[PDB]
Each structure stands twice: as C-alpha cells, then as structure tokens.
Design a protein around this ligand. Structure first.
Ligand SMILES: COc1cc(C(F)(F)C(=O)N2CCCC[C@H]2C(=O)O[C@@H](CCCc2ccccc2)CCCc2cccnc2)cc(OC)c1OC
Length: 107
C-alpha cells in the first residue's frame, strides 16, 4: 500500500476533497536511490484532482492524508503504483516508489 511519513507539518485542518485541485511539488525516487522525476527540477508544480483516477493509487490515498503546507514521504508498493509493468523509460518492473511530496495549496 502507501505509508505516509510527515517531514514537516501542514495546517492540520485543510485536507483535499474530491473535486479540488491539489498543487504539489515532489521528488520521486526508486529503491536503489535513483531519482526518476522531480517537479522541482522541471520547475513545474504538479496539479491533480482527487477522484478523477488521474494518479497512481498510492498518491490518491497518500496525498489525501495531507493538509495544506504539509511535507511528507510517501512509500508506495508496486501494487499501489505501476505493478509488474512499471513504466518503461521511467519506472522499472515491480518498483516500490518513494515520493517526497509538499502540498502547496488547493485550487
Ligand atoms: C507515468 O509517467 C510519468 C510518471 C511520472 C512520475 F514518476 F512522477 C509519477 O509516477 N507520477 C507523477 C506525479 C503524481 C504521481 C505519479 C503519477 O500518478 O503519474 C501519473 C500521471 C502523471 C504523469 C505526468 C507527471 C508530470 C508531468 C506530466 C505527466 C501516471 C498516469 C497513469 C495513471 C496511473 C493511475 C491512474 N491513472 C493514470 C512523471 C512523468 O513525467 C514527469 C511521467 O510521464 C513522462
């Protein structure tokens, strides 16, 4: 599944609701410690809407547990990410993913 470990606290009262757009910055790393992506490196905050099946399960459920301003480490098992397939070119087969995520604001 997905384990959420807080790095820095959010406001503790503003959690994402389906229908809201979450705006975040993240760095994604594999088990071997290699970075597979960073919105910070691309200088482009990642935005997604809960309940629209637009992100992996680990994100859908993990980012949901975060309050605005929170920074947390999400550790996602392959069944909650890309499974056996992975995503050739960025994520290998059966990969456990670790995302350092910061919930900036809700739009
Ligand atoms: C799957 O392909 C990508 C995955 C990432 C990723 F590794 F960071 C990643 O794994 N995610 C992106 C940030 C949110 C969490 C996760 C993700 O959900 O990506 C989805 C979409 C984001 C891809 C993207 C990210 C940033 C810029 C453009 C596109 C994958 C779409 C497939 C899917 C899975 C489950 C349900 N519905 C759809 C970054 C990418 O580009 C920067 C990707 O496309 C080139």
């Amino acid at each position: 599944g997905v384990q959420v470990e807080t790095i820095s606290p959010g406001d503790g009262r503003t959690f994402p609701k389906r229908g809201q757009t979450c705006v975040v910055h993240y760095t994604g790393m594999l088990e071997d410690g290699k970075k597979f992506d960073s919105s910070r490196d691309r200088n482009k905050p990642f935005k997604f809407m809960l309940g629209k099946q637009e992100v992996i399960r680990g994100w859908e459920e993990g980012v949901a547990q975060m309050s605005v301003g929170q920074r947390a480490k999400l550790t996602i098992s392959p069944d909650y990410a890309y499974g056996a397939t992975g995503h050739p070119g960025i994520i290998p087969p059966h990969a456990t993913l670790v995302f350092d995520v910061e919930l900036l604001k809700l739009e």
